[PDB]
Design a protein around this ligand. Sequence first.
Ligand SMILES: NS(=O)(=O)c1ccc(CCCCO)cc1
Ligand SMILES: OC[C@H]1O[C@@H](O)[C@H](O)[C@@H](O)[C@@H]1O
Ligand SMILES: OC[C@H]1O[C@@H](O)[C@H](O)[C@@H](O)[C@@H]1O
Ligand SMILES: OC[C@H]1O[C@H](O)[C@H](O)[C@@H](O)[C@@H]1O
Ligand SMILES: [Zn+2]
Length: 257
Amino acid sequence: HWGYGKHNGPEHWHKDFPIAKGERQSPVDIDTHTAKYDPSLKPLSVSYDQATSLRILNNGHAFNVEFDDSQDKAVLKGGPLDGTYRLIQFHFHWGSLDGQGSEHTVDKKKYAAELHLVHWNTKYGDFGKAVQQPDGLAVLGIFLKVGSAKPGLQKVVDVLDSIKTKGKSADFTNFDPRGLLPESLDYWTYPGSLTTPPLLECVTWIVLKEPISVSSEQVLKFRKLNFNGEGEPEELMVDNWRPAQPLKNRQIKASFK
Ligand SMILES: NS(=O)(=O)c1ccc(CCCCO)cc1
Ligand SMILES: OC[C@H]1O[C@@H](O)[C@H](O)[C@@H](O)[C@@H]1O
Ligand SMILES: OC[C@H]1O[C@@H](O)[C@H](O)[C@@H](O)[C@@H]1O
Ligand SMILES: OC[C@H]1O[C@H](O)[C@H](O)[C@@H](O)[C@@H]1O
Ligand SMILES: [Zn+2]
C-alpha cells in the first residue's frame, strides 16, 4: 500500500488514486505576493473550549489525536466557511532534518513540520458523507519552526514512546488543542484536497501565517516513531509530507491587508 518511500511514495500514488493529478490538489506553494486580501472573508472563530480528546494512534503514516465529534464541542466557523465544522482529529507532517517537513510552502520556503486540525461540515451528518462533498472538510494548517519549546506540545511528545509502531494506541484524554495555536489567526485560504490517499477534493484549506516554535528536542522525538509494525524491520517515521502540487485554476486569498 501507499506510503512515503521511493517505491510507494507521492510519485506512485496516481496509479491507484488517479485524482492525484486532479484540478484541486494539495498542498500548494503560497506565493505571498500573488495572494490577495479578501474583504468578503468574515472573522474566523476557533472555538475549542469544550474539546474532548480521546486517544492517540500510530496509523503507520503519522499519529492522530482523535476527538469526540458526536456533538458540537470543538468547532471552526467564520472566515471562508459557510456553517459549522466539527473537529475530529489532528496530526502532523515532518522531516528527517529541520530544513524540510511541511506540506505547504511559503514563497517556496519549507518549514520543519506542519500541524493539520481536521474538521467536517455538520450539514452532512458524518465524516464519511462529508468527504463526498466539495465543501465537506476544513483543515486548519499551522507551520512549525525550530526554536523555543512549545509547552502545549509537550504532552504529545511524551506519549510517543508508547505508540512507537503502527497499530499502537494510547488513552489521550483531557488534552487542550488551544495550546498548539500561535498568537495571530491571520491566514491564507484556498480550495484543495486531502494530502494523503484517497486525495479527495473536499477541503477548504485555512493556513495560518504565523508559525509556532517548537524545540529541537520536541521534533527529534517525532523522528523516533516507526512506520512499521511491532516485530518488523525498523523504518523511522520521517519525511511523511507530500510536495507542492500545481495551483491550476485557483486563487489564494489572504485574511489580512
Ligand atoms: N493531511 S490532511 O489533513 O489533508 C488529511 C486529513 C484527513 C485524512 C483522512 C481521510 C479518510 C478518508 O476516508 C487524510 C488526510
Ligand atoms: O482538559 C482539556 C480541556 O478539556 C476541555 O473540555 C475543557 O473545557 C478545557 O478547559 C480543558 O483545558
Ligand atoms: O474580475 C475581477 C475579479 O477577478 C477575480 O479573479 C478576483 O478574485 C477578484 O478579486 C476580482 O475582483
Ligand atoms: O492530556 C493528554 C495526556 O497528557 C498526559 O499524558 C497525562 O498524563 C494524561 O493523563 C493525559 O491523557
Ligand atoms: Zn495532514
